Design an enzyme around this catalytic site. Sequence first.
Site, PDB file in Angstrom:
ATOM      1  CG  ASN B   8      -1.929   1.195   1.197  1.00  0.00           C
ATOM      2  OD1 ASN B   8      -1.589   2.109   0.471  1.00  0.00           O
ATOM      3  ND2 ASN B   8      -2.630   1.416   2.291  1.00  0.00           N
ATOM      4  NE  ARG B  83      -6.340   0.224   0.831  1.00  0.00           N
ATOM      5  CZ  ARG B  83      -6.925   0.287   2.381  1.00  0.00           C
ATOM      6  NH1 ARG B  83      -6.168  -0.327   3.245  1.00  0.00           N
ATOM      7  NH2 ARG B  83      -7.707   0.938   2.626  1.00  0.00           N
ATOM      8  CG  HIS B 172     -13.034   3.214   4.361  1.00  0.00           C
ATOM      9  ND1 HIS B 172     -13.794   4.126   4.820  1.00  0.00           N
ATOM     10  CD2 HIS B 172     -11.977   3.185   4.741  1.00  0.00           C
ATOM     11  CE1 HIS B 172     -13.176   5.044   5.454  1.00  0.00           C
ATOM     12  NE2 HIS B 172     -11.657   4.611   5.323  1.00  0.00           N
ATOM     13  NE  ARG B 233      -9.612  11.823   5.181  1.00  0.00           N
ATOM     14  CZ  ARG B 233      -9.818  10.438   5.239  1.00  0.00           C
ATOM     15  NH1 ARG B 233     -11.095   9.935   5.185  1.00  0.00           N
ATOM     16  NH2 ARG B 233      -8.577   9.878   5.228  1.00  0.00           N
ATOM     17  CD  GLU B 378      -8.621  -1.895   4.933  1.00  0.00           C
ATOM     18  OE1 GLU B 378      -8.793  -1.127   4.257  1.00  0.00           O
ATOM     19  OE2 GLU B 378      -8.478  -1.662   6.433  1.00  0.00           O
TER      20      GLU B 378
HETATM   21  N1  LIG Z   1      -8.911   1.748  22.646  1.00  0.00           N
HETATM   22  C1  LIG Z   1      -9.320   2.693  21.832  1.00  0.00           C
HETATM   23  N2  LIG Z   1     -10.597   3.519  22.351  1.00  0.00           N
HETATM   24  C2  LIG Z   1     -10.763   4.615  21.641  1.00  0.00           C
HETATM   25  N3  LIG Z   1     -10.260   4.926  20.158  1.00  0.00           N
HETATM   26  C3  LIG Z   1      -9.227   4.165  19.807  1.00  0.00           C
HETATM   27  C4  LIG Z   1      -8.588   3.007  20.466  1.00  0.00           C
HETATM   28  N4  LIG Z   1      -7.662   2.452  19.890  1.00  0.00           N
HETATM   29  C5  LIG Z   1      -7.480   2.959  18.716  1.00  0.00           C
HETATM   30  N5  LIG Z   1      -8.379   4.123  18.643  1.00  0.00           N
HETATM   31  C6  LIG Z   1      -8.623   5.101  17.502  1.00  0.00           C
HETATM   32  O1  LIG Z   1      -8.805   4.529  16.308  1.00  0.00           O
HETATM   33  C7  LIG Z   1      -8.266   5.574  15.376  1.00  0.00           C
HETATM   34  C8  LIG Z   1      -7.367   5.112  14.314  1.00  0.00           C
HETATM   35  O2  LIG Z   1      -8.185   4.106  13.467  1.00  0.00           O
HETATM   36  P1  LIG Z   1      -7.387   3.197  12.053  1.00  0.00           P
HETATM   37  O3  LIG Z   1      -6.203   2.613  12.973  1.00  0.00           O
HETATM   38  O4  LIG Z   1      -6.882   4.304  10.940  1.00  0.00           O
HETATM   39  O5  LIG Z   1      -8.444   2.436  11.631  1.00  0.00           O
HETATM   40  P2  LIG Z   1      -7.912   0.752  10.775  1.00  0.00           P
HETATM   41  O6  LIG Z   1      -7.343  -0.073  11.980  1.00  0.00           O
HETATM   42  O7  LIG Z   1      -9.430  -0.057  10.567  1.00  0.00           O
HETATM   43  O8  LIG Z   1      -7.152   0.764   9.463  1.00  0.00           O
HETATM   44  C9  LIG Z   1      -7.680   6.574  16.323  1.00  0.00           C
HETATM   45  O9  LIG Z   1      -8.325   7.857  16.420  1.00  0.00           O
HETATM   46  C10 LIG Z   1      -7.291   6.051  17.646  1.00  0.00           C
HETATM   47  O10 LIG Z   1      -7.207   6.765  18.754  1.00  0.00           O
END
Ligand SMILES: Nc1ncnc2c1ncn2[C@@H]1O[C@H](COP(=O)(O)OP(=O)(O)O)[C@@H](O)[C@H]1O
Lengths: 394, 394
Positions: B8, B83, B172, B233, B378
């Site tokens: 990616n 990706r 997504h 955003r 993913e």
């Molecule tokens: N235990 C938690 N409680 C609340 N928010 C969390 C926790 N762990 C991670 N986050 C939040 O999730 C967000 C980042 O998500 P992201 O990693 O981009 O999603 P994905 O894991 O589907 O690729 C951040 O705002 C982060 O602070």
Amino acid sequence: FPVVLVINCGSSSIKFSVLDVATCDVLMAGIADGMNTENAFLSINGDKPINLAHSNYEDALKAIAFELEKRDLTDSVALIGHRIAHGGELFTQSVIITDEIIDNIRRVSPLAPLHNYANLSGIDAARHLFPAVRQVAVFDTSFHQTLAPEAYLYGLPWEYFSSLGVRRYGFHGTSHRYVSRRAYELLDLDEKDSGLIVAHLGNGASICAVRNGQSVDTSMGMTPLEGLMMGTRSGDVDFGAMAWIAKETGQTLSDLERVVNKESGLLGISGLSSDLRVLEKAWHEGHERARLAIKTFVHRIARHIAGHAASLHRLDGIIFTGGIGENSVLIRQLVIEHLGVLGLTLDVEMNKQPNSHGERIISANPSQVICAVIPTNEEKMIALDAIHLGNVKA
Amino acid sequence: FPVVLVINCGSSSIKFSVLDVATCDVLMAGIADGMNTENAFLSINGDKPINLAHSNYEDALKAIAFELEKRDLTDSVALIGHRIAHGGELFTQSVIITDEIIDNIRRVSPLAPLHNYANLSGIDAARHLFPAVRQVAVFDTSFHQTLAPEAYLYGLPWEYFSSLGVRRYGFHGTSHRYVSRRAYELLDLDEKDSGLIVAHLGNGASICAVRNGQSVDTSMGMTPLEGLMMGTRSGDVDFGAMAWIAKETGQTLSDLERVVNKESGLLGISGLSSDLRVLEKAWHEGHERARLAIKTFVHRIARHIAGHAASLHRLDGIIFTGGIGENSVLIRQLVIEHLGVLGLTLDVEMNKQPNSHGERIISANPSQVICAVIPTNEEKMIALDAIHLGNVKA
Ligand SMILES: Nc1ncnc2c1ncn2[C@@H]1O[C@H](COP(=O)(O)OP(=O)(O)O)[C@@H](O)[C@H]1O
Ligand SMILES: Nc1ncnc2c1ncn2[C@@H]1O[C@H](COP(=O)(O)OP(=O)(O)O)[C@@H](O)[C@H]1O
């Protein structure tokens, strides 16, 4: 037999109605169009348009004032109601007009430049022509002032909100307020424990969630351009897309402002008309783009109606109103069928009835949610506020 | 024991994972950050960041390629998955990469300048370094290509759509696709007769309505900026408001483009952080703006979840996924409680379980709709597509 003179000054027109205080019926109505133009006119109930050529807002209203005197209506005008486009966060209800109110209206006017200043012109004219008459201001935004922060804030930097006043305001307030009051009656609901969704569908269109008598969500935003796709307005639109379009066609925001307000929505997609009636016939005749415009229009309405329902603890009814909501048999049907997920059941024979049948329920019994059409009457709502305020000691 | 190399390429980074074809487990993962910068590095599983200073996308991947050879992984790489951010209307499914695919990807790239060109850089590099390896392209937009016109068209003049390609695309896609497949299993639903709403909540956030296995509505638009309010955003925003803001602060669209993408959303409202964890603690400590940011974030999520449900004939489940959807106990609870109108019932003890509990149901029995958390993967979805395509005779 006192009457209420109701006024609505637009950027290029002045609509007016004279309602009987006793029955709230219209005794006279008119409209001075082509304002500020070398050729302005005044048509009352259809009567041959008078020559108001080269006349400002006050002369136009002076002409309307003469038409009321020429009909011995002048002496019975006990109240005047002014429709105001934008009240900002200063007005949460209709008020008796005084110097303070005028000042306040000017303060929030920057929020609605193309409408509020015309509203003020109307106020100054009416104040000049009817000095001894109590006058009231009814704001299109006041009904939505009950919205919680989570519902009116935009995801922009806090500064834009606190120092510039950027937030959702919503419009069609008087209609949504009036229609929802009528709904508690028609649906035999207890205002204090109720959930309604009103779909005001006209050339301008918006949805409103009324929880226990209060607006808790509405589709338009800081301006009437957000939310549903409309006659010539785009409705919700990806800002990134608007930005992309700018870099591709080399257009400015004023260019895009025009496009999104005048050449979009139903007109833009159909490339035919902004008028639903024309489009419905176009579809019937096989016009694909007219069909897409309508389908899109319906899809977005269903989406927002469902989205707004999320602000209710319970969904008791969905009310359709406005020129389109009151007269479009097909649009109502399509929207409702697009909401089967909510358990709605339509009674087609009831939905087929023309608007002459007034406040009417259009859903069948098995329906989990009651659906109805309630003709809106903003002039009446304004008069009712004026009449109430007419008993005050200012 | 063949493995799949998944890549990616972002505007300034290159994330990668090596999954075992047999179990789809991660055997290695890494990330080359600070790309095109005078100081770039490569950190694998945490191992001390190597010095990739002054290196382009191909060298970075050449370094990653050496790290796989230094671990005798090179010879077992049977497939490579790329990706791709944007596939326009040309890609409706994952494909084996050939010259035609590369050409096509370039054609739609104008739709995602800040992402697609980096994706292509990654493809060229991988093609150079693994010539004898079959390579696949997985588009973040392909899953949403099943959307009907009424659901992807904007209320803009038809020309913008037909000649410029302006329409909703959604993102997504791989997550929404993967998570919904997992949901049919977890919820024991028949894919062919089902209604799901997936809430992918990460630093980037979007909702997706999956009807009978197909995406029928999604919250992002032509760009990832539309829909839900996110980390930085803004999400949906009144264009009239954006226009008003321009005339008031004398900013351009690029200025506003920046604000809406980098300084808005959670960060913008809280004026504290884009990270939910930080904000949740801030709220606990009495921070009002952090509370407003979260409440607004929750309000908009509930609204879109309900709005998207309108595209379903029946609502069977709501699935939470992504960094936030998988780990935020409070946000899930607040969103769900904001959807009581749909008859949702939360099982707090089940909702309290940490993400280590994997695919899990968090709603109680009386619930009209099943609620669950399904961790997204993913990389696994991309590998599964690659493995399937690995049996093709191209
Ligand atoms: N235990 C938690 N409680 C609340 N928010 C969390 C926790 N762990 C991670 N986050 C939040 O999730 C967000 C980042 O998500 P992201 O990693 O981009 O999603 P994905 O894991 O589907 O690729 C951040 O705002 C982060 O602070
Ligand atoms: N019988 C009808 N069927 C479909 N659309 C109609 C019908 N009558 C009026 N309309 C539409 O309603 C719209 C104008 O509504 P509007 O008059 O601004 O609402 P309001 O009457 O609440 O102030 C037009 O698009 C018009 O074509």
